[PDB]
């Protein structure tokens, strides 16, 4: 504690800031939750229990803000509330991440599970899981000559670190990769469909302006090769594909005339394609471009916001712990270890006030967040 006089200003500053910011943010959060006290489809329940964890972590804080060098059961309660803050934050962020991944990869399986029963079941499952994560680290009373809770053959450290932090990190990352690939694969698909439509229109134009039927054949074959894989991208998709079936039929009707050698009759039979387009595919291109942005944009920014809150609040502390224990197995103690864990715990508790930043762009009543 060589920097205790420094800490006497550092930690009350940071924890006062965290207390006031997280308290007023979660205050307005649960007020807007009261404003929508029933409609919690699948994500608002995750957000509300994470709010519960954060606000109990804050209501157990005003004892710890009054600190100096200088009970025991109250200190054990502070330890358990810290752990049910951090582990609940991690596991609920990753369950909300897999919720978004299920929603924006298999939406039918999402609507299968969008009901309150299975969602609240998985919620209470990870809630009893985080209650199972905190009690094993509560054996001895931390009082030693305040608490002196900081230090302490240990082997369960990296096991808890892995299960507690490492597995969750890999999950959110693969969920983000799946979301980015699914949103990037229905992107190149729309790009190639627009390219097919553009080459179809350009070759129709060169048909209607060209002579010398040896090139109206060259335009019609490109038009057909475009239509055949434009139709590849249910009772409405059937009427989408029937329009392209009759379009390719008209293409063939023009192409056999071009093969016979009637360049005027071929442009006459190719003229009907714009009529077929306007009657069948113009009213579907707007849907295919606009609807298939919106909910998935909310999902993408929610995943990336969970990733950045993760990698700036739970990564420093846990890599600090794996660094402090990687010193083991090979063999002053308060040099470059106490201030490191001090500031990384400050980050792992700063997640509690960075958590309204999740809601104001992600879920749980963004009305006053926009206001």
């Amino acid at each position, epitope marked *: 504690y060589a920097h205790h006089s420094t800490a006497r200003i550092v930690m009350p500053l940071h924890y006062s800031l965290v207390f006031i910011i997280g308290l007023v943010g979660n205050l307005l959060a649960l007020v807007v939750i009261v404003q929508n006290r029933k409609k919690i489809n699948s994500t608002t329940l995750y957000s509300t229990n994470l709010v519960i964890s954060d606000i109990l972590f804050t209501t157990a804080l005003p004892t710890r803000i009054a600190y100096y060098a200088m009970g025991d059961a109250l200190c054990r309660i502070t330890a358990l509330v810290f752990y049910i803050n951090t582990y609940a934050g991690v596991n609920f962020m990753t369950c909300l991440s897999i919720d978004r991944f299920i929603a924006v990869v298999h939406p039918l399986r999402y609507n299968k599970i969008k009901r309150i029963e299975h969602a609240k079941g998985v919620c209470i499952f990870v809630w009893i899981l985080v209650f199972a994560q905190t009690l094993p680290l509560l054996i001895n009373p931390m009082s030693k000559q305040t608490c002196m809770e900081y230090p302490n053959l240990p082997w369960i450290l990296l096991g808890a670190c892995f299960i507690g932090y490492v597995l969750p990190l890999i999950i959110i990352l693969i969920c983000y990769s799946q979301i980015c690939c699914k949103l990037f694969r229905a992107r190149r698909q729309l790009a190639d469909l627009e390219d097919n439509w553009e080459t179809l229109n350009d070759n129709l134009k060169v048909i209607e302006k060209a002579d010398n039927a040896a090139q109206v054949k060259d335009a019609l*074959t490109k038009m057909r*090769a*475009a239509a*055949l894989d434009a139709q*590849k991208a249910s009772p409405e998709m059937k009427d989408f594909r029937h329009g392209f*079936d009759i379009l390719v*039929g008209q293409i063939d009707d023009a192409l*056999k005339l071009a093969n016979e050698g009637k360049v005027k009759e071929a442009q006459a039979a190719a003229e009907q394609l714009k009529t077929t387009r306007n009657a069948y595919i113009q009213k579907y291109l707007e849907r295919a471009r606009s609807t298939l942005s919106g909910v998935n944009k909310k999902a993408l920014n929610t995943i990336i916001l969970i990733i950045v809150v993760f990698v700036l609040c739970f990564t420093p502390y846990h890599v600090a712990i794996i660094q402090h224990m990687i010193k083991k197995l090979r063999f002053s103690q308060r040099h470059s270890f106490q201030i490191s864990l001090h500031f990384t715990v400050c980050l792992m508790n700063f997640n509690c006030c960075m958590d309204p930043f999740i809601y104001f762009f992600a879920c749980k009543g963004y009305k006053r967040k926009v206001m």
Partner: antibody
Amino acid sequence: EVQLVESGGGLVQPGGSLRLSCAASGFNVVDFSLHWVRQAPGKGLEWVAYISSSSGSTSYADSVKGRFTISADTSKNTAYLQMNSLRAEDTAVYYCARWGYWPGEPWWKAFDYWGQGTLVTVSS
Amino acid sequence: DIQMTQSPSSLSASVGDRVTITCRASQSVSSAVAWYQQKPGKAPKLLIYSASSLYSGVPSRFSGSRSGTDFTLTISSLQPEDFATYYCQQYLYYSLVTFGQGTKVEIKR
């Protein structure tokens, strides 16, 4: 069962004439377009001509245009290929294929039922 | 007029290998190419149509796929009866049929 049969191959003089006949059984030649794919001895396959007796769309390869004429007498359920003015490089095995009309899976399958092929020999 | 180049003009492999034959189009036909197999002396046989879909009647070791204008036929476990010439036909219109040059899979030794 659908089963194609060719006939009419043999020896001809360079510049002569010949008539191949692709008899069909099972399906009818109205519902399908009958093609002719030939394969020179020791070479790859090449497309020659086709006919679509549902409409009439006799087209030919660039190397046999004006020299071959394809007919389809659907009362006999066969298709014919009249090869006259035969050059020396026209010796091959002439297969007869089958291709369904658009739209749907009959078109998306290519030549799925071929004949056994008849061999012609253009020699002097 | 659409060229169709089939590159590995002769493969050598043994019973149980995994061979792969590729095929590239001049223009950009859609997923309309077919793969054939011609045992010497007989007529061809359809294996793949629509560039990926397996024809009904052939074993499931053959499996084609498509990437742009690069079509490829893969055999997974090369049984001793898969030793023949494999062609590559595009079918975009009736009068625009062009076959590949045909690769001859043969016995490694």
